[PDB]
């Protein structure tokens, strides 16, 4: 109200409204789902088009051979943050000959987003990210919020109508975690999860975007007729 | 440093500081530009509220940017000096590096770029100035006349006016200027420029300045008596 003019101002109940408004931009964004087993981690993203002549906005970005994310909200902010991750993954490789841990990648994103919430002049990031990866401690899935809060999960979903996919994963928890050494079945579960967040529209060939990383699987993105198999 | 964003968008998609800079131009004394077949003429209004002035030393309204290009303006006088100085420096810089004087279009593009930069730079307000830039490209006999404005847009004009009551003199020029046959001589071009100012000026005494620019760096400013002869001839034909 009077305490939402900038990020440097707490409200009387201890709230940061600019951060909460940035959080709101994620809810307006298109749905994306993340889930993992012990061997593989999968991202599924519903891409959004402007109209029928337009292309479908890309939702998934590769950060390294073993790590990448899907976005929901302001896409340019995701580009800034994914670029930062690319650099941090790259610094770890060049200097330490070491693949960056997915947990440490989350810690770095948290700290970058935080600085924008405490300083005058700047603004919070207006995007939510789902980071998947496979490192020395197996498969991982993270959820990044622009408040700074990063959370390691078995599965999750962010964006519009994401509550439907999140409930499905909460039921299927015991099933999909056990899908080891079977990428296609893990993607199926992800495609079935994101389907719980659909209304009116359905998953078409240029609508769906899938990514996967695992034990002997580099981070690869599937678009177009490559995902027709899963429709 | 002072970084405050002064020029910003409003809900209806307007940058008020740029638009308020145009209002400063509207206040400024009238300036007119007319190009003939082999010449360009720049007319300028001098408000007669200020007498006891020393016309020898008072800053003239038309300024030479180089030996072949001139710049007149309407709006804030102090602001115009900054644009003129930058333009003169860029004119010499262009000769130094390209080994050729600026084209009138290039010089206009530069001045317009400066004006634009001041509409999305922090800590600065836009220039309260619109300019008329006229001249002849090196080794070219085609007349050139361009206009700029605070927003940074620019364009070429067969004839144009800016400043106070510019709506009236633009009305005059739109009906009196023929594109198929422009003022063939210097006389015809100056006469049309004086006529257009006489719609607005008041008295045709020391209130009208005329500057004629011809090809190959031939620039001259008309005196009071020379202009007064045009004023005399125009009204004597009008009494009919």
């Amino acid at each position: 109200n009077n305490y939402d003019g900038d990020t440097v101002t707490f409200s009387p109940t201890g709230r940061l409204f600019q951060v909460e408004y940035a959080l709101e931009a994620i809810k307006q964004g298109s749905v994306t789902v993340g889930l993992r087993s012990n061997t593989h981690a999968v991202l599924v993203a519903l891409k959004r088009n402007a109209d029928e002549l337009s292309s479908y906005q890309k939702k998934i970005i590769k950060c390294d051979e073993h790590m990448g994310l899907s976005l929901a909200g302001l896409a340019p902010d995701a580009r800034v943050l994914s670029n930062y991750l690319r650099q941090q993954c790259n610094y770890s490789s060049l200097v330490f000959n070491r693949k960056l841990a997915v947990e440490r990648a989350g810690h770095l994103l948290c700290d970058k987003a935080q600085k924008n919430t405490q300083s005058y002049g700047g603004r919070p990031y207006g995007v939510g990210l789902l980071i998947i990866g496979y490192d020395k401690s197996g498969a991982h899935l993270l959820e990044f919020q622009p408040s700074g809060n990063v959370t390691e999960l078995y599965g999750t979903a962010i964006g519009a109508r994401s509550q439907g996919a999140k409930t499905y994963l909460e039921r299927t928890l015991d099933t999909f975690i056990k899908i080891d050494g079977n990428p296609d079945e893990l993607i199926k579960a992800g495609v079935e999860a994101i389907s719980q967040s659909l209304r009116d529209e359905s998953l078409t060939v240029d609508n769906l975007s899938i990514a996967i990383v695992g034990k002997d699987t580099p981070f690869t993105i599937y678009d177009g007729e490559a995902v027709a198999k899963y429709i | 440093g002072y970084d405050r964003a002064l020029s910003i968008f409003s809900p209806d998609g307007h940058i008020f500081q740029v638009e308020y800079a145009l209002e400063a131009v509207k206040r400024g004394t009238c300036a007119v530009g007319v190009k003939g077949k082999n010449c360009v003429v720049l007319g300028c209004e001098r408000r007669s509220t200020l007498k006891l002035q020393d016309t020898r030393i008072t800053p003239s309204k038309v300024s030479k940017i180089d030996s072949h290009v001139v710049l007149s303006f309407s709006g804030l006088n102090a602001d115009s000096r900054i644009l003129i100085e930058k333009a003169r420096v860029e004119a010499q810089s262009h000769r130094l590096t390209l080994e050729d004087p600026v084209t009138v279009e290039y010089l206009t593009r530069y001045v317009a770029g400066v004006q634009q930069r001041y509409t999305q730079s922090g800590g600065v307000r836009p220039f309260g100035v619109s300019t008329l830039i006229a001249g002849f490209d090196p080794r070219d006999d085609e007349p050139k006349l361009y206009q700029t404005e605070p927003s940074g847009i620019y364009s070429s004009w067969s004839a144009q006016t800016i400043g106070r009551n510019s709506k009236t003199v633009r009305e005059f020029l739109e009906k009196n200027y023929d594109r198929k046959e422009p003022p063939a001589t210097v006389e015809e071009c100056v006469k049309l420029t004086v006529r257009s100012l006489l719609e607005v000026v008041q008295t045709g005494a020391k209130n009208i300045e005329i500057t004629v620019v011809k090809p190959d760096s031939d620039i001259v400013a008309l005196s009071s008596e020379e202009i007064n002869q045009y004023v005399t001839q125009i009204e004597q034909e009008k009494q009919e």
Partner: protein, 212 residues
């Protein structure tokens, strides 16, 4: 290195050798010492290989940006001065360049500028640059006229490089010929000195000193 360029009736002739050395070691016999800056501008290369290469292809980027911005072909004067002003900033740092910027425009006609890593920029009708420049000058100055045919001018340039290729130990390999008109440059082939020498000797009756 031997490079030359000269103005004449039919435009400009540019001729260069092909050798590159590191001390007495012949590093390459197939070096392209002429840069195709655009369809109308040529640059010659002498001195430091990389300095010439890097900054002359850079020059082409600056010329392209000029004609994008000004909607007009860049002049030979302006193009040469961009390069000379650039190297002048680096003066003292140790750049090593001897270049001719050759082109034709409407306003200038055929024009040649000698540009130099010491900052020297000279307009002229004839220039020879490199370790074998003196040898090329001998043939050029005694046979040059304004009224030469494109065919005869091309041969004189070819012959002047050959003269230097023979005597100068740091010149040789082959001869690259270019002919610059008002519709652009026209390449006139790579001519191996190992075959050209014996051909010229026989046909011209020259080099009677050498036994063949």
């Amino acid at each position: 290195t031997t490079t030359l360029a000269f103005r004449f009736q039919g435009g400009i002739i540019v001729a260069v050798d092909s050798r590159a050395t590191a001390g007495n070691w012949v590093a390459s016999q197939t070096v392209k010492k002429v840069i195709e800056i655009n369809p109308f501008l040529l640059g010659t290369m002498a001195g430091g290989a990389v300095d010439c290469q890097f900054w002359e292809t850079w020059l082409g980027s600056q010329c392209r940006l000029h004609e994008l911005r000004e909607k007009e072909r860049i002049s030979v004067a302006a193009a040469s001065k961009i390069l000379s002003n650039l190297v002048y900033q680096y003066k003292g740092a140790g750049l090593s360049m001897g270049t001719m910027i050759c082109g034709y425009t409407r306003k200038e006609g055929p024009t040649i500028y000698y540009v130099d890593s010491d900052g020297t920029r000279l307009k002229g009708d004839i220039f020879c640059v490199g370790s074998g420049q003196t040898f090329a000058y001998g043939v050029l100055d005694s046979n040059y006229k304004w009224d030469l045919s494109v065919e005869d001018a091309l041969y004189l340039g070819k012959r002047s490089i050959l003269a230097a290729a023979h005597r100068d130990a740091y010149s040789g390999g082959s001869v690259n010929l270019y002919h610059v008109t008002e519709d652009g440059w026209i390449y006139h082939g790579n001519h191996d000195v190992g075959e050209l020498f014996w051909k010229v000797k026989e046909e011209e009756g020259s080099f009677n000193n050498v036994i063949g």
